[PDB]
């Protein structure tokens, strides 16, 4: 964070999508890139939960206040965002 992201594994880019799945309301199978979570209502009750489950579930070392509401937007941001391959920040 702040230089030099984290780098994740399509396994850990596999379980993330599950996750998003539920706190979204949005079927794994429908989950594209074209989904937006501003778009589709995302809540700051929602988009911490989701960037907690990853701490708690998954174990990523994201961040204590993680928000998809506010750190992220698309579901492709989320993904890149796990390597840090677009080095935005």
Do not use: H, Q, W, Y
């Not at 949005?26 to 937006?36: F, M, P, R, V």
């Not at 929602?46 to 701490?55: A, D, E, H, Q, T």
């Amino acid at each position: 964070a702040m230089a030099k992201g984290v780098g994740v594994s399509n396994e850990k880019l596999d379980a993330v999508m599950r996750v998003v799945s539920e706190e979204s309301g949005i079927a794994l199978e429908e989950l594209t890139d074209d989904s937006n979570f501003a778009d589709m209502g995302i809540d700051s009750l929602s988009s911490m939960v989701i960037g907690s489950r990853f701490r708690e579930d998954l174990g990523l070392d994201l961040g204590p206040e993680f928000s998809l509401f506010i750190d992220c937007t698309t579901v492709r941001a989320l993904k890149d965002f796990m390597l840090g391959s677009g080095d935005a920040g």
